[PDB]
């Protein structure tokens, strides 16, 4: 699709069999989702956003569907205010910015 | 242009007579620029992201040139770690997300 930006670019994602809403975010290097259970091991990561830095749990090689497109990659879990799909998975679904 | 997302989508902007680098950010509702002077009236505002909130000055009806395209809108000025062009100005240059 072609998504205009008059409203937030929210899409449905599916992770762990669950549907969630997430924001397609070209200003995010990585994908960050609200607290949930994911399989496997995690590693620590610090991420800096507008209000300072927070600690998240990094899970690698996680299967996630984004707007009907399949991706398999890194998901960070932590106290983000909204689920964000960042460039690491936007690239997997072929997304570009155009003007 | 078509901007891929393998790296941060940074562009040059002109604002307040100054050239700056800024992130084209579909996850940002508003445009937020690092501390600088702008003319006219302003009012305080709080905006929240990962890490929490920062206080900014809200200036309305500010012209910005973004990658060569002029636009007008509200610009928030405050201690953001990066200059962000948010949806309120991305729409005016006709930016879309495509995949
Ligand atoms: C988290 C998003 C929902 C919103 N942000 C935009 C993001 O694209 C930021 C932009 C931004 C800010 C500060 C530093 C870098 C980028 N990304 C981000 O935090 O990525 C960071 C967090 C994580 C995400 O993936 C990696 O990217 C960095 C570090 C890791 S925001 O910068 O907090 C932001 C911007 C304008 C806004 N306008 C508003 N208005 C409200 C009142 C409706 O809120 C705003 C919040
Ligand atoms: Cl505006
Ligand atoms: Cl349009
Ligand atoms: Na003004």
From TrEMBL, chains A, B:
Limits of the Peptidase A2 domain: 20-89
Segments forming a coiled coil: none
Lineage: Viruses, Riboviria, Pararnavirae, Artverviricota, Revtraviricetes
PROSITE patterns given in the database record: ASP_PROT_RETROV, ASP_PROTEASE
Origin superkingdom: Viruses
A Gene Ontology biological process term: proteolysis
Localization, UniProt: Host endosome, Host multivesicular body; Virion membrane
Statement: the UniProt record of this protein carries the keyword Protease: yes
Gene Ontology, cellular component aspect: host multivesicular body; virion membrane
Protein name: Protease
Keywords: Aspartyl protease, Host endosome, Hydrolase, Protease
The UniProt record lists the keyword Protease: yes
Molecular function, one GO term: aspartic-type endopeptidase activity
UniProt topology in membrane: Lipid-anchor
């Amino acid at each position: 699709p072609q998504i205009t930006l008059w409203k937030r670019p929210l899409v449905t994602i599916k992770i762990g069999g669950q549907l969630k809403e997430a924001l397609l975010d070209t200003g995010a290097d990585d994908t960050v989702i609200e607290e949930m259970s994911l399989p496997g091991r995690w590693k620590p990561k610090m991420i800096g956003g507008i209000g300072g830095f927070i600690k998240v749990r990094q899970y690698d090689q996680i299967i996630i569907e984004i707007a009907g497109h399949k991706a398999i990659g890194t998901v960070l879990v932590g106290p983000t205010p909204v689920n964000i799909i960042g460039r690491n998975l936007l690239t997997q679904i072929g997304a570009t910015l155009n003007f």
